[PDB]
Ligand binder design. Structure first.
Ligand SMILES: [Mg+2]
Length: 224
């Protein structure tokens, strides 16, 4: 079914257009995914200059179809079942004591490449907060993404809390509320409650002078 499109390495393109408090920026990413291992390897570049928010705050927005679903849980993989026509992911990301991002992403194949096209709008950020003040460490904690079915919208929802490390030892919470809805009208898999366990490693390309992020991520379904 759509899962058949993910048995090997798949090239990935990510394109993001953003506006946070009137700071306009764009990000382009390239890399590949291998759902057999739940593995993503991507490099993202800010093509407009300096990124006006910290890179870690964009990780969740910057392809859950690459999650490794164990064989015994394959009937719960909504993301691949929506392919190749794709799905639309919408999120509200609420930064505790600060502003919010609202995002819309279309995830679909363009020929044999998996594309994630994103619009991000951020409002009500504090000039001197952890986000616009760039007070977040360049690292990333492991988290669970809790998925539930939304049968009346033929899709899924997700809820989860990201904890961003602040440079003083504290934590910036980012509450995520997510909806995913198929683009096509073929049948999709509507899962039982489960989660995705995600681990992410952020690094820099030593030969790259543009503002950028190298990401290695592993995503594995569990909870059934
Ligand atoms: Mg207002």
């Amino acid at each position: 079914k759509g899962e058949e499109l993910f048995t090997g390495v798949v090239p990935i393109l990510v394109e993001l257009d953003g506006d946070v408090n009137g700071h306009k920026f764009s990000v382009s990413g390239e890399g590949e995914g291998d759902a057999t291992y739940g593995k993503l390897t991507l490099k993202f570049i800010c093509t407009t200059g300096k990124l006006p928010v910290p890179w870690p705050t964009l990780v969740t927005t910057l392809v859950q179809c690459f999650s490794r679903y164990p064989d015994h849980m394959k009937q719960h993989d909504f993301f691949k079942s929506a392919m190749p026509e794709g799905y639309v992911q919408e999120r509200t990301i609420s930064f505790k004591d600060d502003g919010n991002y609202k995002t819309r992403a279309e995830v679909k194949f363009e020929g044999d490449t998996l594309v994630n096209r994103i619009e991000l709008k951020g409002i009500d950020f504090k000039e001197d907060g952890n986000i616009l003040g760039h007070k977040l460490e360049y690292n990333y904690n492991s988290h669970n993404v809790y998925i539930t079915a939304d049968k009346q919208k033929n899709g899924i929802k997700a809820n989860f809390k990201i904890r961003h490390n602040i440079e003083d030892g504290s934590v910036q919470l980012a509450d995520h509320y997510e909806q995913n809805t198929p683009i096509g009208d073929g049948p999709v898999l509507l899962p039982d409650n489960h989660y995705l366990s995600t681990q992410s490693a952020l690094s820099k390309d030593p030969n790259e002078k543009r503002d950028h992020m190298v990401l290695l991520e592993f995503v594995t379904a569990a909870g059934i």
